[PDB]
Symmetry: D3
Subunit: 156 residues, 6 copies
């Protein structure tokens, strides 16, 4: 519990919300793994490596963090990791019941694996990766919405 947390997502792209979660979650663990899924199902906008490199670039000055990709069931990724704690974010627009369902379905697959929920700062309470995508797609100013370390590649 008090050792190795995993924070999974698509990180498409990473936002200031994701970064608050990584921050707070960071304080609480020894190693924290940022687990960038592939999420072929959800239509990805940025390539897994673009995404993984963006997080990598945003997560660098967090001395506890490591970022990585993966494909299969999150529950097993945690097994491989001798990880009993999933970190998830909660926000105004979260589908709360779906989150709870995922936490139990993860528990059901790996009887050792708990989920823990953190919230972003009030300023980031309404940021979703989805609105950020549209802002980027229609060419808006997303600069107060994502970490500056990624301005370069969001523009390419």
């Amino acid at each position: 519990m008090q050792k190795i947390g995993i924070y999974p997502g698509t990180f498409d792209p990473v936002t200031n919300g994701h970064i608050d979660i990584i921050h707070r979650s960071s304080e609480l663990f020894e190693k924290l793994i940022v687990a960038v899924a592939h999420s072929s199902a959800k239509n990805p906008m940025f390539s897994l490596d673009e995404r993984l490199k963006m997080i990598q670039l945003a997560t660098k000055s967090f001395k506890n963090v490591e970022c990585v990709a993966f494909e299969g069931l999150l529950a097993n990724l945690a097994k491989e990791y001798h990880c009993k704690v999933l970190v998830r974010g909660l926000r105004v627009v979260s589908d709360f019941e779906y989150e709870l369902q995922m936490g139990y379905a993860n528990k059901s697959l790996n009887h050792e694996l708990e989920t823990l929920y953190f919230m972003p700062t009030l300023q980031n309470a309404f940021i979703s990766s989805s609105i950020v995508r549209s802002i980027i797609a229609h060419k808006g100013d997303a600069s107060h919405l994502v970490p500056k370390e990624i301005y370069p590649l969001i523009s390419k």
Copy 2:
């Protein structure tokens, strides 16, 4: 505020619920711009151009309504028209928090951009575009759910 409101949505297709919001909200501004967003992210059942035609036909009777299509960001649209107030509809099946969220995003992209929410008549309170789509795709009769002026166009696949 009195001068210009914009009512933006996907309108896929426009529904009697939408028309209630347009009716009521038009009364409140000198001009109402109804703005049909391309919305590529969802895979709209109807084309951008079909949706614009549909809503033009449906809104002809409202003297101070103008329908455009935009593939811009809504903030630029607003700027273009010196518009400070967006209009949005609320219905029983709305995703209320997602609508609040859009409302704050729209403000922060355009600092004088506020959103105002209307509700349709009770008869149309359970109508969404999404349930009209399903009825239509399954060859059901949706003519009670949509203005009669678009019924020719919905009839084509």
Copy 3:
């Protein structure tokens, strides 16, 4: 409909979120009636007299805003002023389906009467009267949550 809108409430007490709704709504109507409800069943923390004085102090700066104490059904208040628009606040914690219900209930009693919903600003999105009352009850600092003019009165 442009002539006159009514924003009813308990205003127990008036908060910065309520002031945002007054400000924006007063910009859209020739007059804005702020109607202060008895709210008997609620057993408010502050008396009617206190609540009405706080509304008047907070709203001095808005030249076209008037205050009135009232009792009971929104629909009849609205016919008394020949008003077709009720203004309502929407927030993260709003019970939205109940808002919709009230709006229909009110149009039933009075067929001309529409309900129109404003939001507060982001920094007030999480502010409720109720939370404000805990802070004052527990003798915390509520000064960043309520208008400055009210502040002397709100302190017991």
Copy 4:
């Protein structure tokens, strides 16, 4: 009314949640029709004919249950079977107002057709087809999530 109910679904695949609704609903009507929709717009993991086969196998022990495969409008299907009751399952992640919406719509398309809601057992309240699908696609144990009768045809 009691002479006949229909329980429509994609059943992709049938899960222990579905079997609870079928069991309980079959207890209330003389006949229950379990109606497996092609649901071509979805992109079902299993073909219509496998889904149909699997739910037939899973329901043979319920003597008053009959399965059929259909394509188009359910409200019309129901008229063909002289059905006045559509059976729906509620579970923890249901979109509740959407369920009500669907009920009212189906009633506007067929004025005899009411919707009635059952719930699964507590154990199955958190079970979604979607989740069973992911697990199945990977190397996951779904044997506790779907009826034994079908767990063979799953990896076929």
Copy 5:
């Protein structure tokens, strides 16, 4: 499961909802028991005996419906009636997760007792007893919201 259903509630007062539901559910069981709970702890506006009288007057035309007033545990009342089905209405403002919670609580107190959910007609989907009470408290007109055979008893 066919012979007898119970439809519990406070019925304070009975609305054109308690009634669409009585109508619909009474078509499914040989006998429908309408159980008026004393509900002491909600301080109902109308007394138990008044609510009972209202609901009897309003359900006289339904030949297989019987009304009873009670106050213990509803699960134990169900047992006394050899009842395996609790009937509940869902409406736009229902707290859905609370209804599911209740259905599971009762199931755990009486292992034969399931909960089944109906909806009222669309026109009544917004009707709430509390909205009827508030209209009444404030001398409004509630006559289009409650069945006509109770209108004498409520104007009083």
Copy 6:
């Protein structure tokens, strides 16, 4: 940080869910303070003296858990214990947005104070103190929903 977490509430009464959260949360902090709040304006079924005793009895086995009665601002308690983490539980029946609003309100009164959320086990996912109170008040058996150490006191 990790040194100290606080789990506040009414605990009216402590339930199996609360206990699941204490279990899990106590494994992330050296010390966990269960902070018993005074239920102001909340219809408290059990006395403060009862609630504190039930939770001490029930948490005797967890060695790093201390239980205290607090009659002040929560954010302030946290300051007094030099605590930057509030532990909270998430359930199926939670008011999700209200919980978030509370997280944010506490941050604004104490800028160091973060909120972390746990789920209980699946079996307890639908349990709340509210449904336990109602079952106890109606004289039903709540022995499966509350820890065995507090049964004596409940019947007080």
